[PDB]
Structure formats: C-alpha cells, structure tokens
C-alpha cells in the first residue's frame, strides 16, 4: 500500500503529571475547549491512552515533539 496516509498523536497515561496539567496542556498546545481537553485526560486516564489528533505523519510529529516538551508520553502511528 501507500504511505501518504493519515496518522495519530496518543498521549498515554503516566502516573506523575497532574490531571489538571494534562487538560491544560491540550488546551494550549491545540487550542482544544475546555470540555474537549478534559474529555481527552480522561480517556487517557480511564482507558490507558487517548487520540489526541490527526493529520499527516509530519503533522503529528509536531504534535508529538510539542507534546515531549510540555513532559506528556505521546507516540505516533498510522492510522488505519
Ligand atoms: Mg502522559
Ligand atoms: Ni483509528
């Protein structure tokens, strides 16, 4: 198949960073509303991980790097 296909930031669940700092963090790295940044913490927090966006591979490899900066355990992957 081809690899000009769309991929997916997750953020996974770390036992350190507050719940609040995580929804904050969605707020300012994506400009996500409130009641959208906290729905994605709590996916993280409940199920383990959460998409947190989606675009091109080079699209989420920033989202990833704002994501390492700001002390989030975010990865990468094609979504299918
Ligand atoms: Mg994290
Ligand atoms: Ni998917």
Redesign the pocket.
Known sequence: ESTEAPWVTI????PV?LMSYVTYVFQKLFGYSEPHATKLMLQ?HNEGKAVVSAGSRESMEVDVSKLHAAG??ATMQQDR
């Open positions: 953020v996974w669940d770390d960073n993280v989030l355990w």
